[PDB]
Symmetry: D2
Subunit: 305 residues, 4 copies
């Protein structure tokens, strides 16, 4: 059975990327570490888990590790772990720099290790169920808004830290083969992201990614207009479809965690399985920098006009 | 009290307009006329409406006429009605061809008559209500679908008879200075429209018009993403907004009159008011062909 | 073709009991009258309809008439019309007195005329569709609340003027054969109705009628718990059912008036048809004073304790 | 930091309680024990929980124990656990028989231990939130159904293992001084419960408990008709209220933890708090058997 390590304080991890390891079957949680040797000691004790004192040890005694620390650190962390011959699964941004990412993708292969990005969304039960229905899709629009989170970081940061999630999911749902027709980027006076919306075209299918940081509501939705059906998904939890017989709400499994709905579980499992079976992850190599390449293409333009 | 006349007793007429033009305290219905004359007499009797065998007969006995018949016969009917000194309220496509539409508009200006297009959606309480909240709007999408209506008519008829609604409403709701950025059109081998979507840009705001003729849902909706709130309107009847403290469902009073929510009532009132007050309607002049100028271009480009 | 007369100013009638005569097919609207010879002259003109100057004339030149005037007048009006050999359809309360009602039911029969109460609810498309589904119903509860209408009239009035509607519909839906097990009646200091809720038992099936005059919302609902399904109906417009495959919203016919949803149309038509076919109306004779007999049974108790 | 022990690793235990008793900063999980011992060892390892071959072994190593096993074995387990100076939090039916339940309560008072019943619904944010708005309530109905669960157990087990939830919650939400007015019970030829409904009266307020084992819906709801507002709560997660200005949907934060919305978390915290603070829990004494005294009577009367 594999030993798994976790890198990632507890801001978010404690909520999902931690109770998700409260499974234990086929693999074990072999300790965890984080840069803030302080706000991590408590959770390690409260959860009864080994607290590595340095990334060196944590890597030493692990076969694979989930990295959920700051996006700025992702590169170094993954870079260190990979060099320790450890399998890694990094959170959304591979590295806050396109090249740096293409390099980790090289290192990982060049060292017969598996490196995949944690696109929990490609593992949400409802998004996967939808993907097997968009065969005759004509319109696909995804929204992810924040009530009031005009993040202290600049546009660049928020693009790789939030919008990337929308682009990733949208492109994965369309079959990964769209073009960037147009869109917009709105920032306040502080150069901070306020809004973002773009349009893609995968043949006849029209894709739309949309995000607003001050919409007075934290909602996430996916709308699909296909031939014979109209499907809508709210918060990866609600599923409504119309097939000419009235609006139908798919039943929500009585005992299902939110960590399973967002695709966290399925992502971990698919990571753990690829290690053993020694297979290529769904989000590795090209699939790990894809959407990032697009997000980058946009920024490269919205910073020249 | 003007004398109101009606043209075209087909479906919508009897379901929407007629019920609006019968219960009137400020005007009176004095006649009707269909290019078919078939079942026309029984229909008119149903409404106690003196049937007119001819337009020039219906015109010679009216002051203002609401036209609603095959988009093709519009020009011939409107120009005639306008030559008889009768104010007219045309139904959606002013005329089948763009130049024709303008011809009628000009003909109305010279003749000094009130010629407006009946864009009922511009008078829907909830839509006009929404138009006042989009000051800080960033995203605006309007969706209008059919469960399975790839009806006999071709792409050209559908663009002018249905997709125009979306394009005109969306542009009206967002200032009215947007530009076409792209989109697509899909038709089966017969040339009948199947799907249509387009993107417009009025500054930072992104507008989207979408219509699918076979999506399994006859739903209509408007989605707005503003600064500090999210508004959704379904079938011109349901209003939901979220401003940081949970979704709210605006109340729906006994005023619940489909004919009123959908804007028919207000459209009629507005037409007659302009006629009696000799003012310019919200759907006249360049405004009665702004969306059509757009829809036409989309079609022409498709055929090239 | 029959000539139909209408008695009923325009408070409500103008909204429904009037645009409902904007049909005309098999019968004609032969004028209308009301006690207030003032606030009725306008509508008669605006709707282009003959304004009888007295109930005498209106009855003289009609074959049947819809009575939608004050409940206090119902008796006299119907009593006059019946004596004029005219067929009548009276609004909800037959007479504000049980005996008086049983007398009109006699007169009407004794004069080979048809007298039915206008229980528009027994003709609402969704309530009728429900009735054919309550075969294995175990629980049936109906609510009818007003946002803030603590009516100037006393408890008695409001019981025959509003609660009667709930009791009628509830009993008709259960098959008309329940018993009054219990309930409550709450009035303010002015002796005005504030609340009302009762429980009936039609064998195993438990029925509940519920009304509050100050619930801060004007909603009407019907809930059914049957064997194999869970059905809910809001405002005679919305229909949701759960049959183990998720919640399903029945589609609302695109072009359907509200006057048709509340059962107004179907009620008029069924009235007009019984005249010609000379058949017994669904709400005539015993079915016209039924629920009223119950409403009365309650009051007779809530006015002795 | 008390030592927490668990009894019964069946379903709910692993889905609700365990996940609540593992992530703890104020206490520690020190063991577990099932009357089956089958797969028990693999389960405990899954949670890194030293398996106890015996109760007196689990007890000898704990301070407080959360019991959740076959309603029948409750008495034998609780009395034993109480004889070993261990505070216990029993699962719904304190004991299978009423006198037994009281026996345990008394045994806890003498022994000076904290004995409470785990009524998670009394600690659900939304339910406790609602209990503060029913000051002017007139009607209160709680509905809990199953799509098709006429499970093996008979009417008696179901009344105590499921219908008790409704009866206890409803009574708790409405003051707690209601009286049984009537209702009905339905069972198939096998004697398995099919449906149950009852009416209570606490003054002018009317309370209704309803449960059907095969209604095609696993829905849970609470309906309140107060003076000036209408509140609806579905599956302890959705809150809707209408106070004259349209229905409102209370917001649902990232706090979205089924285990928390359903009250499990708060129930645990409350138990341990009372133990360490030596105070009386909200579900102890007469309160740990108020609804059971009612449900039993209903059953006895049915069997007469």
């Amino acid at each position: 059975k594999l030993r798994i390590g976790v890198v990632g304080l507890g801001g978010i991890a404690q909520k999902a990327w931690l109770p998700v390891l409260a499974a234990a079957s086929d693999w074990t949680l072999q300790g965890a570490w984080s840069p803030t040797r302080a706000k991590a000691l408590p959770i390690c004790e409260s959860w009864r888990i080994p607290y590595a004192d340095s990334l060196s040890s944590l890597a030493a005694s692990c076969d694979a590790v989930f990295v959920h620390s700051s996006t700025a650190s992702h590169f170094d962390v993954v870079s260190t772990l990979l060099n320790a011959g450890v399998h890694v699964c990094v959170d959304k941004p591979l590295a806050e720099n396109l090249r740096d990412a293409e390099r980790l993708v090289e290192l990982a292969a060049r060292k017969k290790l598996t490196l995949m990005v944690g696109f929990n969304r490609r593992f949400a039960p409802l998004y996967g169920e939808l993907k097997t229905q968009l065969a005759t899709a004509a319109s696909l629009r995804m929204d992810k808004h924040r009530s009031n989170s005009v993040g202290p970081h600049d546009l660049y940061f928020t693009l790789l830290d939030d919008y990337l999630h929308v682009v990733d999911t949208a492109l994965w749902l369309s079959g990964g083969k769209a073009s960037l027709d147009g869109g917009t980027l709105l920032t306040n006076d502080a150069g901070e992201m306020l809004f973002a919306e773009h349009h893609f075209s995968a043949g006849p299918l029209q894709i739309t990614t949309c995000m607003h940081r001050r919409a007075g509501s934290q909602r996430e939705t996916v709308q699909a207009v296909t031939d014979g059906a109209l499907i809508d998904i709210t918060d990866m939890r609600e599923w409504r479809e119309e097939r000419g017989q009235g609006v139908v709400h798919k039943p929500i499994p009585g005992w299902q965690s939110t960590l399973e709905q967002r695709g966290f579980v399925g992502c971990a499992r698919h990571f753990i399985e690829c290690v053993q079976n020694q297979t290529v992850p769904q989000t590795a190599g090209e699939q790990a920098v894809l959407a990032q390449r697009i997000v980058d293409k946009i920024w490269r333009d919205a910073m020249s006009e």
